[PDB]
Amino acid sequence: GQLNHELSKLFNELWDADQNRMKSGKDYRISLQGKAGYVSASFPLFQFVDEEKLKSRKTFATFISLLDNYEMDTGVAEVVTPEEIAENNNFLDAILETKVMKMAHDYLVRKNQAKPTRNDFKVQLYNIWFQLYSRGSRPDSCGFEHVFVGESKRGQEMMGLHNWVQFYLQEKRKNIDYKGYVARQNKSRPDEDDQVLNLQFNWKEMVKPVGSSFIGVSPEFEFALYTIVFLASQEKMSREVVRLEEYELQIVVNRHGRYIGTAYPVLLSTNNP
């Protein structure tokens, strides 16, 4: 309901501490073009992105290796292969040396929602995020797939998908048709440089609901936010009212017991401070 003081504050800090960056202009350029639906986008949203900064040097690399894994797939969904494991491991490893993740860590330690040691925290995170779970039994999906891949199932109906890095990847592959941005009547225009937008895209020509997306943010940023919100409540869904920078947000996560489900931001307003 009301603005979550402690979390808008902690998150603002993580935002300030997002060393791994990516910055609007030199690192990526987006083309807003036009409005989705109302009174025309044609080009891709992402006019440019520094591929080398993605292409390792950064935690985007380990991130992209997990995204690509679910692209190829070669495999049934109940099978966790030695390969997917080492990749899960490499990602955790990378994000855990990050100050955002050390910061996130410190918060949850203080609440005894996480343990002091790096490895237990890494295990905790593995289970929340990479342990397979099912809707019956038959664990065919995990938290990273719901949140970042953009859909649970393998196999697809059909997102899900709010991560900017996955949007960029799937857009390049021509599976995402960007339709425009979504504003409000009154309350004016978004900007190429905004770090949260309301965006609409078709998935393989399927028209679907508008959703919000963090833009440029590192994957250890969202990961952190989603983990913390996931641990902050014992119910099926939290919609945590945040105010990051100028944006007023809702940090939503769906929970499935000890495992996390779909998670995303919801944009409430832009020019606020």
Side-chain angles (χ1 to χ4, degrees):
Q2 254 286 322
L3 170 53
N4 189 315
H5 287 212
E6 50 138 46
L7 290 185
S8 20
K9 154 177 182 42
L10 163 68
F11 292 172
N12 273 119
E13 294 169 28
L14 304 181
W15 183 278
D16 290 341
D18 204 13
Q19 325 272 105
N20 302 126
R21 208 102 197 215
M22 316 245 308
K23 304 272 220 121
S24 169
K26 286 169 93 298
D27 300 332
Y28 73 84
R29 205 169 186 149
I30 57 156
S31 183
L32 285 174
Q33 299 164 78
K35 307 100 198 316
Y38 68 103
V39 184
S40 279
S42 180
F43 305 85
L45 169 66
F46 283 100
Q47 87 101 191
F48 152 72
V49 48
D50 196 329
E51 290 271 301
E52 78 137 0
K53 295 182 169 315
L54 288 185
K55 204 198 177 291
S56 284
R57 97 161 219 172
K58 288 176 183 260
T59 44
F60 294 87
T62 52
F63 193 75
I64 289 170
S65 287
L66 279 168
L67 282 169
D68 302 1
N69 174 243
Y70 295 82
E71 251 303 289
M72 327 172 197
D73 116 302
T74 158
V76 80
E78 288 101 308
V79 84
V80 55
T81 76
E83 200 67 54
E84 298 175 326
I85 309 275
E87 288 174 16
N88 291 345
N89 272 281
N90 274 276
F91 189 83
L92 287 173
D93 287 335
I95 64 164
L96 267 11
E97 36 192 48
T98 248
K99 75 170 276 192
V100 169
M101 282 300 257
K102 278 164 186 182
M103 267 163 83
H105 194 193
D106 285 6
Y107 180 83
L108 304 166
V109 175
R110 295 220 154 172
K111 312 271 183 174
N112 183 46
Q113 293 177 344
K115 294 300 164 162
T117 81
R118 166 107 54 217
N119 199 249
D120 296 323
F121 197 50
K122 178 193 190 193
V123 176
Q124 189 193 13
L125 257 42
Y126 192 91
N127 298 335
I128 291 179
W129 275 99
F130 306 105
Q131 179 57 47
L132 297 174
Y133 67 88
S134 78
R135 244 310 196 111
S137 206
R138 268 35 84 151
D140 66 352
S141 156
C142 78
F144 174 96
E145 208 181 323
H146 287 57
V147 178
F148 295 116
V149 169
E151 69 187 4
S152 67
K153 292 89 247 271
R154 158 113 217 121
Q156 14 223 72
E157 246 181 273
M158 54 182 90
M159 327 212 111
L161 165 28
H162 304 229
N163 185 259
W164 73 273
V165 177
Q166 176 76 317
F167 187 113
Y168 169 59
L169 294 170
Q170 292 307 326
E171 174 174 89
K172 267 201 308 193
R173 295 233 162 182
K174 310 217 175 315
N175 299 332
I176 286 186
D177 191 356
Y178 168 72
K179 303 313 283 178
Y181 62 80
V182 164
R184 315 101 190 156
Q185 5 128 256
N186 217 41
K187 340 296 176 181
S188 299
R189 72 168 66 250
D191 184 281
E192 67 184 45
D193 245 87
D194 277 302
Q195 236 86 186
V196 187
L197 296 170
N198 282 303
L199 292 192
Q200 203 171 343
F201 63 98
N202 298 173
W203 179 242
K204 276 160 191 201
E205 304 195 58
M206 194 82 57
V207 66
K208 66 179 182 46
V210 316
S212 322
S213 310
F214 293 116
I215 294 180
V217 90
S218 67
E220 64 273 11
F221 181 98
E222 318 191 350
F223 199 97
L225 238 65
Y226 298 154
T227 305
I228 294 151
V229 163
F230 173 75
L231 268 345
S233 196
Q234 279 211 277
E235 47 198 1
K236 265 140 175 183
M237 176 182 253
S238 289
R239 303 180 85 211
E240 292 296 341
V241 175
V242 163
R243 196 153 156 209
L244 260 166
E245 275 273 29
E246 59 190 86
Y247 323 108
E248 175 183 27
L249 301 165
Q250 242 168 27
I251 295 314
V252 23
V253 326
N254 299 93
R255 313 196 172 84
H256 307 263
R258 63 195 133 112
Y259 315 106
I260 172 92
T262 284
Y264 49 93
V266 176
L267 189 68
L268 307 179
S269 51
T270 57
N271 277 182
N272 283 292

